[PDB]
Amino acid sequence: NWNGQLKLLLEWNQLDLASDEIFTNDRNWESADLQDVMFTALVKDRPKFVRLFLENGLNLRKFLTTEVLRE
Amino acid sequence: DLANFIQENFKAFGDIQFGKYIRLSCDTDSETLYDLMTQHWHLKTPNLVISVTKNFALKPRMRKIFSRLIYIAQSKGAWIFTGGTHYGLMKYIGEVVRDNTISRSSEENVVAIGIAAWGMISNRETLYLAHYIMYCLDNNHTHLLLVDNGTHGHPTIEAKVRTQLEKYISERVIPESNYGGKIPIVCFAQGKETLKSINVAIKSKIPCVVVEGRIADVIASLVSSCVKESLLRFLPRTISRLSEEETESWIKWIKEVLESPHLLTVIKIDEIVSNAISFALYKAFSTNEHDRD
């Protein structure tokens, strides 16, 4: 369950460690997987993590639906 | 006229807009293929690159490396070779190509010239100029030559014949080419498919370049127990899927790759790409000793 392991490291603002452990080539991820993490990433003002999520194939125009903007 | 003539010989090949592509089954003469490409259109090749990559996540620097590679190919005038259009690294190459053309335009152009099989792709209308709508393809590549004859589930069938063509062009001689009649050829490694193609390349006496998480990383680490240690270090999950005897086959292939040191070349962590390419070429030119005098 790499998602929870990622959530914990997202709480504390730690990038260098997270890149290595959760973002290696063996495992895979898609935007559908990362939408919720992205939402919190934006809300809590975690910029470098937004960079990390955008580098690894997160389509931003697809993520911003009108409901998310209302929220 | 000539196109309709070719279809009869092959026993259909228009252009898709939304470049020109051709369909060939297999065993086509490499000389005839190159002659047709020159006859119909295009021009001679001062230098052509080949790359073998299967999803992979781009890194902050890898994009710089490959953008520089494509810029150099633009500067000199070159053909690039890629396998299919499965999105990933090759799709990024296509995007860089498309960006470069509009960025510069003016004189000259670059060609991707991708190669793949008929079976892997989804169905498409068969001729004149049938439109195409998006196992998958990339829009950036200019032309893709089609291979693999008649198959529906055969995987990586074209991967053989592609290497064959990669060997042929070198043999062709052009006077006053600035390389003594031998057009240069270089391989760039981004996994297992690249490993096999490296052995084919070396057997064809073609220098290759390897970046400083796959076979390429194992090759860099190298710079029996040795093979197994590097293999286990490079990829935990990949080795487990392979059977024990497949590891012996991997040992044999790695031994073949390391057999000759001079042809192979390695990058080290702005102009590093250009320097590596030139260095690779230079080693081959130096081995013969005919350039020495």
List helix spans (H) across A1-71.
Answer: 2-11, 16-22, 31-43, 47-55, 60-63, 66-70
Beta strands in B248-287 (DSSP E): 265-266
**Residue B135 one-letter amino acid:** Y
In angstroms, how far is CA B282 from the centroid of its own chain? 20
> Do the beta carbons of residue A27 and residue A2 sit within 8 Å?
yes
> Do the beta carbons of residue B73 and residue B96 sit within 8 Å?
no
The number of CA neighbours under 13 Å toward the Cβ of B286 is 9
Tokens of A5: 């392991």
User: Do the chains contact at A57 and B235, CB–CB below 8 Å?
Assistant: no
DSSP one-letter string for B162-206: HHHHHHHHHH-B-TT-SSTTB--EEEEE--HHHHHHHHHHHHTT-
First to last CA, chain B: 50
CB < 8 Å to A24, chain B: 213
Indicate the angle between helix axes B62-76 and B89-104, nearest 10 degrees: 50
Is residue B55 less than 8 Å (CB to CB) from chain A? yes
Burial label for B149, CB within 10 Å (0-12, 13-18, 19+), is middle
Q: Scanning every residue of chain B, which has its alpha carbon at the shortest distance from the alpha carbon of A53? A: B57
CB pairs under 8 A between A and B: 17
CB < 8 Å to A23, chain B: 57
Cβ-based neighbours of B241, under 8 Å, separated by 6 or more: none
CA–CA separation, B109 vs B199, rounded Å? 31
Q: What are phi and psi of B244, to 5 degrees?
A: -60, -45
DSSP classification of residue B262: T
Cβ-based neighbours of B117, under 8 Å, separated by 6 or more: B84, B146, B147, B148, B151, B154, B156, B157, B158
CA–CA separation, B85 vs B8, rounded Å? 28
Is residue A25 less than 8 Å (CB to CB) from chain B? yes
How many separate helices (H) and strands (E) can be counted in chain B? 11, 8
Chain A stretch 32-71, residues whose beta carbon is closer than 8 A to a beta carbon of chain B: 55-57
Cβ-based neighbours of B180, under 8 Å, separated by 6 or more: B290, B291
Is residue A26 less than 8 Å (CB to CB) from chain B? yes
Burial label for B153, CB within 10 Å (0-12, 13-18, 19+), is exposed
CB < 8 Å to A31, chain B: none
The SS3 call for residue B50 is strand
CA–CA separation, B9 vs B142, rounded Å? 24
Which helix (DSSP H) or strand (DSSP E) does residue B259 occupy? Answer: helix B244-259
Is residue B3 less than 8 Å (CB to CB) from chain A? no
